[PDB]
């Protein structure tokens, strides 16, 4: 879909990170609030049927 | 200007000097002036830099560390490659500009901090960035923070030291 709305950070400092398994969009959608800043107009869908 | 242009019986070429004494006898090492664009390259020792910054602050005192704010860098390289604004660095940049803009009367021509750009190389900035005829260049030596070096896509000229002939 067309995007809904449209400098520096410290948590993104590449000296302080450990990438053991690289984040992917499946994770960013499974856990909307853990894996995303400013998650707005979001539904949190989950199912352990 | 007469050391750069060399003795009238034996002129120099674009960016050459006659010996090494004369070349290293002054802070201004290179100067090119495109039609009305000015690119100057200074090389300061520790005490030349300290005195310059002293006389700068004496007149335009910055007690509130707001020199860091006006400084404009190139938001086209990654922050790993931009300029790093430490106190000594941005203060040298501003002192150098303040000292060059004082040589030019204001009724003749002037020079503005908003359209200019100063770039320091020190023990904190290993990159020297400049911006010439249409190009946006950034020089990084091998001795300084290149543990890692490649030879890759052509965007990277490999400058070479014409005395020892080693890159």
């Amino acid at each position: 879909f067309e995007p809904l709305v449209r400098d520096w950070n410290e948590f993104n400092d590449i000296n302080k990170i450990i990438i053991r398994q690289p984040i992917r969009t499946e994770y960013k959608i499974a856990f909307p609030y853990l894996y995303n800043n400013l998650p707005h107009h979001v539904h949190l869908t989950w199912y352990h049927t | 200007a007469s050391e750069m242009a060399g003795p009238p019986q034996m002129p120099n070429d674009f960016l050459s000097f006659q010996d090494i004494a004369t070349e290293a006898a002054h802070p201004i090492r290179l100067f090119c002036r495109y039609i009305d664009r000015i690119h100057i390259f200074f090389r300061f020792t520790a005490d030349e830099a300290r005195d310059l910054i002293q006389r700068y602050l004496t007149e335009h005192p910055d007690p509130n560390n707001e020199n860091i704010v006006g400084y404009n860098n190139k938001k086209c390289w990654p922050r790993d490659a931009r300029m790093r604004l430490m106190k000594h660095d941005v203060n040298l940049g501003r002192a150098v500009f303040w000292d060059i803009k004082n040589r030019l009367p204001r009724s003749v021509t002037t020079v503005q901090w908003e359209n200019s750009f100063v770039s320091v190389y020190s023990k904190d900035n290993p990159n020297l960035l400049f911006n010439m005829c249409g190009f946006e260049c950034r020089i990084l030596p091998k001795c300084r923070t290149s543990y890692e070096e490649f030879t890759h896509k052509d965007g990277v000229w490999n400058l070479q030291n014409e005395v020892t002939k080693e890159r």
Partner: protein, 47 residues
């Protein structure tokens, strides 16, 4: 040799000590052509 420090030789020195970012552009003139928004517009867009 006593010397002369580098940049002492030059012909000119401080051109305006007083000028310290006073507001020529931050006063509101109610004149269309001589206002300082127009001076900025004109000098940005004409060459």
């Amino acid at each position: 040799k006593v010397k002369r420090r580098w940049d002492d030789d030059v012909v000119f020195k401080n051109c305006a000590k007083g000028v310290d970012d006073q507001k020529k552009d931050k006063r509101f003139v109610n004149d269309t052509l001589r206002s300082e928004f127009h001076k900025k517009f004109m000098e940005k867009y004409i060459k």
